[PDB]
Amino acid sequence: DITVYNGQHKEAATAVAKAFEQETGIKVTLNSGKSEQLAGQLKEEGDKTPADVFYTELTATFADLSEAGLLAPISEQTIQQTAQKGVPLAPKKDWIALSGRSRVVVYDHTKLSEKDMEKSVLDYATPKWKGKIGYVSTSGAFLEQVVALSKMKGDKVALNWLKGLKENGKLYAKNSVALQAVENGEVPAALINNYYWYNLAKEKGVENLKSRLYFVRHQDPGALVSYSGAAVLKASKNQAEAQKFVDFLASKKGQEALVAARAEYPLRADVVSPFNLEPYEKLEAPVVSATTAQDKEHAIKLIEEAG
Ligand SMILES: [Fe+3]
């Protein structure tokens, strides 16, 4: 049996854990919490950690653990199961990206078409969109978007975009609230994550939704994908089973279990999501270095500077 520190959505973790237990008979105990807290705890616990695997919604969480020498090598063959072009790879082969979530533009298709959409996410923060673009400044993925803009286009462009959103955007407290605002005709478009829309479409039926998604693609900063993944702890005294679990997460069966439970993009190219997601390769995500704590502090300062 194994213990998995779980930073991922609990529905996803419970689903892959159940599928693993059903496939192998090896029991999984989830210790679910915030990834940044769990990462800190793994570092503090060091050689004495009871964690066999760390399963997270953000692979950036692994960088500090890897550099601290706390992660075990995983099989090159396993890593290759999800190593599509664009997918982040552990330089030390000590973690694996498994799935992703995408930034997206959601829009009211009864007011707008794709003709009204923009080439770049940068262009939504302009006077055309005054009173007409929803954004969620307190959102984690929004912050990742700001980090990506700074990295890809520089701070001035990132700050200009944020100032553009202050001037032109409508602020929403959460992504769910922004999605509902678009559905309800309050605002014609909003910047959110893919999974909110696909979840609503699955529950209510797309025929009953006024909103649709627009993907900028073309490696635009707005095509940003955030990657979930897993790593085995070096300190684990149950390497064989921990490696078996990570191998399972990258397997067709494990990926199928994940995508049935959560509207993330699988990184195997022989698994199809029941949520009706496009293939990961079609997204044309940009390649962006992992977010560090320093990146986040810098992005937070830009948000504050923009008002
Ligand atoms: Fe969310």
UniProtKB/Swiss-Prot annotation:
Function recorded in the entry: Part of the ABC transporter complex FbpABC (TC 3.A.1.10.1) involved in Fe(3+) ions import. This protein specifically binds Fe(3+) and is involved in its transmembrane transport.
Subunit structure: The complex is composed of two ATP-binding proteins (FbpC), two transmembrane proteins (FbpB) and a solute-binding protein (FbpA).
Recorded family membership: Belongs to the bacterial solute-binding protein 1 family.
Phylogenetic lineage: Bacteria, Pseudomonadati, Pseudomonadota, Gammaproteobacteria, Pasteurellales
Domain of life: Bacteria
Coiled-coil annotated spans: none
Chain positions recorded as Fe cation binding sites: H9, E57, Y195, Y196
Compartments it resides in: Periplasm
Gene source species: Haemophilus influenzae (strain ATCC 51907 / DSM 11121 / KW20 / Rd)
Keyword hit for Phosphoprotein: no
GO molecular function: metal ion binding
Inducing or repressing factors: By iron deprivation.
Name under which the protein is recorded: Iron-utilization periplasmic protein
Major subcellular location class: periplasm
Effect of T14A: In strain: TN106
